[PDB]
Amino acid sequence: MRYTIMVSATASDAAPLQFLAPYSGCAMAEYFRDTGKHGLIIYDDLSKQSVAYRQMSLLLRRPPGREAFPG
Amino acid sequence: SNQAVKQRIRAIKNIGKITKAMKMVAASKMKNAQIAVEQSRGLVDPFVRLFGDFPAVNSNKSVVVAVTSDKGLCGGLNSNITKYTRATLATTESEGKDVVVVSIGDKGRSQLTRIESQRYQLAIADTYKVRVTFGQASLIVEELIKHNPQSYQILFNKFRSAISFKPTVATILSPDLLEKQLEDVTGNSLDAYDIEASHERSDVLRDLTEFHLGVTLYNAMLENNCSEHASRMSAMENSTKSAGEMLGKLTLDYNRKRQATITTELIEIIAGASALM
């Protein structure tokens, strides 16, 4: 943990928080990309982030495509 | 296109129960033919200790018999001894001899013509349809003595267990066309025996090698028939796996199409409702 940031949007959190959490963590890791250091970002279940975003798009009544995911 | 994938699961599920029926059809036929192949193994033993075993002789004329199956879900059994035919039919020719190639079993004429069609002269089939008897194997032997070679070659699969079928070459020399001519070294190996026949020793050996031909032919097409059921059993096991692996990939493909057509029909319904509301 001396070198790790842990960004957590769990299964009970709101779907916009789970949708935003990989962008939140990428922005924290882009601090090290932008200052000459090196980052390592892990998006654990990016398949769970698309399901959270599918929830927000269907609740916004946007038209679903293949497997009811948005375009 | 959701019925084409559903009718293929109709096919592979019926195949995977056909081929599991043929697995145990061949399994029960392997066991009641093992009680006939062990009783028949005795009579080949005195003729190989009386006359010995001489595969590589320089015969002038030979009759080679590759005894195969009639039905062909065997799994490369009828091809392995067609392969072992030319492995011995190129080996024992060191002088340019006559060879008559014979096949017992209907799957032999279709594969021996592919290698030797100019030496293939006889085709015995329909052998195992009722059973294999010695009188039947006698008549097959008497048709082989119409041609008189100096040697006979019988190529068959020896049923060792349900797993291993090591093929055998069993050789029968004609009675003094080569047979006593191979024992007579510094005397004779056959002259130890006191002949109790009606006529001459050269005449009883004429009787004795036809009987040695009919015995090792009766064993050959009884060893091979029990080796055929035990390779169909291993072939029909490998095809129920292949029809279970294919059925598993089709059911994953069907569930994906089942989920996709429920999503597709629902998106069509909501789009038609949102166009009105």
Automatic annotation (TrEMBL), chain A:
For the ligand (Mg(2+) 3), the binding residues are D44, D45
Q: Tell me which residues bind Mg(2+) 2.
A: D44
Its domain of life reads: Eukaryota
Write out the transmembrane intervals.
none
Tell me where it resides.
Mitochondrion inner membrane
Role of this protein: Mitochondrial membrane ATP synthase (F(1)F(0) ATP synthase or Complex V) produces ATP from ADP in the presence of a proton gradient across the membrane which is generated by electron transport complexes of the respiratory chain. F-type ATPases consist of two structural domains, F(1) - containing the extramembraneous catalytic core, and F(0) - containing the membrane proton channel, linked together by a central stalk and a peripheral stalk. During catalysis, ATP synthesis in the catalytic domain of F(1) is coupled via a rotary mechanism of the central stalk subunits to proton translocation.
The family line of this record is: Belongs to the ATPase alpha/beta chains family.
Task: Report what the protein is called.
Answer: ATP synthase subunit alpha
| Species in which this protein is naturally found | Polytomella sp. Pringsheim 198.80
Note the residue range shown relative to the complete protein.
Answer: 282 to 352 of 562
TrEMBL record, chain B:
Known CDD domains for this protein? F1-ATPase_gamma
SUPFAM superfamilies linked: ATP synthase (F1-ATPase), gamma subunit (SSF52943)
Alphabetic keyword roster = ATP synthesis, CF(1), Hydrogen ion transport, Ion transport, Membrane, Mitochondrion, Mitochondrion inner membrane, Signal, Transport
Question: One GO cellular component from the entry?
Answer: mitochondrial inner membrane
Q: How does it sit in the membrane?
A: Peripheral membrane protein
Localization terms from the record? Mitochondrion inner membrane
In alphabetical order, the GO MF annotations are: proton-transporting ATP synthase activity, rotational mechanism
Q: Which PROSITE patterns match?
A: ATPASE_GAMMA (PS00153)
Which PANTHER family does this one have?
ATP SYNTHASE GAMMA CHAIN (PTHR11693), ATP SYNTHASE SUBUNIT GAMMA, MITOCHONDRIAL (PTHR11693:SF22)
Give the family this protein belongs to, as stated in its UniProt record.
Belongs to the ATPase gamma chain family.
Protein name as catalogued:
F-ATPase gamma subunit
Gene transcribed to yield this protein: atp3
